[PDB]
Design brief:
GO cellular component, one term: extracellular region
Oligomer: monomer
InterPro entries: Pec_lyase, Pectin_lyas_fold, Pectin_lyase_fold/virulence, PEL
Number of domains: 1
Largest sheet: 10 strands, parallel
Number of helices: 7
CATH class: Mainly Beta
Bound molecules: a molecule of 5 linked components (ADA-ADA-ADA-ADA-ADA), calcium ion
Structural class: alpha/beta
Family: Belongs to the polysaccharide lyase 1 family.
Protein name: Pectate lyase
Catalytic activity: Eliminative cleavage of (1->4)-alpha-D-galacturonan to give oligosaccharides with 4-deoxy-alpha-D-galact-4-enuronosyl groups at their non-reducing ends
């Protein structure tokens, strides 16, 4: 079968659990679409009621920051009449505003501005849907696919630059505050039975190195690449190429969302993370299988310096096998970041700069995560992971 009609293999990660991930493979003739712009994409997707099996082939580049006539939209198109960056900056400067939460005119205007862009860039993917790139050049630019539904396949697409024109200042996000933005390339919001395979995720033509610092903090226009939240469950992400981006993959959005316990069952395999700063993945609660992934970066990079690969967040249950990390000068311990409530990590076969390490032991974590993955394909020896992943991961590698 072609990419449009293929299903997730019955053994291929958490996505294959129970009813599995078949997407729109069973689509009838009238439910197979080819789309080349935002209008056609939105029409094909329809509403949440569009639950018939459907296949959507993306042809070429789809820019999501466009109006109903496909005219490009930018900052001044989305901006609320009362919003002004100069005045926003002046209002919430720590020097005069202190560390209290931004409120009042400019913040309210910024929030309205953000909702205006959200209306264009963010689209929900309905149940029983396969979306695949045709050829080697299928792109979604500026877009944020959200999956709240069951049974969705996304393959062979380059996702670029999910860009927020209205980053929000949070003076208490970290010791010196942070700017936060809203759009991921894909957000799995309670979504279940999902396969994301042979996609590419990057920051397009607007990497973080092109954004200024305000209040000494990067004016951050990007969110995640592939996040998962709110009881998202039974997901396989494979053969994806994540590059040139800060916060990649956050699974479990809050230490307070204890309902995520027993959920966020995700398998990550054969993914490439090049010049990714952090969260690859950052996990709270979930039984996450991480195997045969390749990580490459530099702690001294001028654009996207490596911070950590795996985030051991609250009650996380990461099971890692035969992953390869290539970051010069990095210690065994610093391959991961351990957050409060994170106490356990299973990792075997971890190669750091060509040397076998034990990331869990280096961080004093328990090696018992209370599970062993049964749903996986063949496991590559660590010695072959770099070659296999570079050769195979990302969009335009099949077609
Ligand atoms: O109305 C809607 O559109 C939605 O509302 C609900 O969702 C909210 C929110 O709107 C979503 O954007 C999302 O955001 C998550 C967190 O709430 C947010 O703080 C952020 O979090 C991550 C990370 O989890 C967090 O710890 C922190 O990271 C720190 C530090 O800030 C970093 O600089 C770095 O040093 O790492 C640290 C660390 O790892 O701990 O900030 C992170 C970040 O990305 O900046 O992003 C989260 C995310 O994007 O997943 O979910 C919220 C939620 O409550 O679910 C609603 O749930 C949704 O359904 C919509 O309706
Ligand atoms: Ca943050
Ligand atoms: Ca976020
Ligand atoms: Ca996000």
């Amino acid at each position: 079968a072609d990419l449009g009609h293929q299903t997730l293999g019955s053994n291929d990660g958490w996505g294959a659990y129970s009813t599995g991930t078949t997407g729109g493979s069973k689509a009838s003739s009238s439910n197979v679409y080819t789309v080349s712009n935002r209008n056609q994409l939105v029409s094909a997707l329809g509403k949440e009621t569009n639950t018939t099996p459907k296949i959507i082939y993306i042809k070429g580049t789809i820019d999501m920051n466009v109006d109903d006539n496909l005219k490009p939209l930018g900052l001044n198109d989305y901006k609320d009449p009362e919003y002004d960056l100069d005045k926003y900056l002046k209002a919430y400067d720590p020097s005069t505003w202190g560390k209290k939460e931004p409120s009042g005119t400019q913040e309210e205007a910024r929030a309205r501005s953000q909702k205006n862009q959200k209306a264009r860039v963010m689209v929900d993917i309905p149940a029983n849907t396969t979306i695949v790139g045709s050829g080697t050049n299928a792109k979604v630019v500026g877009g944020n696919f959200q999956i709240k539904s069951d049974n969705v396949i996304i393959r062979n697409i380059e996702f670029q630059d999910a860009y927020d024109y209205f980053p929000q200042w949070d003076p208490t996000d970290g010791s010196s505050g942070n700017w936060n933005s809203q759009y991921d390339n894909i957000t799995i919001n309670g979504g279940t039975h999902i396969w994301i395979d042979h996609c590419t995720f990057n920051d397009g033509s607007r990497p973080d190195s092109t954004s200024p610092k305000y209040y000494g903090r990067k004016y951050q226009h990007h969110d995640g690449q592939t996040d998962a939240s709110n009881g998202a469950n039974y997901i396989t992400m494979s053969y994806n190429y994540y590059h040139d981006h800060d916060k990649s993959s956050i699974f479990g959005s809050s230490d307070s969302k204890t309902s995520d316990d027993g959920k966020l069952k995700i398998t990550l395999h054969h993914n490439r993370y090049k010049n990714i700063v952090q969260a690859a993945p950052r996990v709270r609660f979930g039984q996450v299988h991480v195997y045969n992934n390749y990580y490459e970066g530099s702690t001294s990079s001028s654009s996207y310096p490596f911070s950590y690969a795996w985030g051991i967040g609250k009650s996380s249950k990461i099971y890692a096998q035969n992953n390869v990390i290539d970051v010069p000068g990095l210690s065994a311990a610093k391959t991961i970041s351990v957050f409060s409530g994170g106490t356990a990590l299973y990792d075997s076969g971890t190669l750091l700069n060509g040397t076998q390490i034990n990331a869990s032991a280096a961080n004093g974590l328990s090696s018992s995560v209370g599970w062993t993955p049964s749903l996986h394909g063949s496991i590559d020896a660590s010695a072959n992971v770099k070659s296999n992943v570079i050769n195979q991961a990302g969009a335009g590698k099949l077609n």
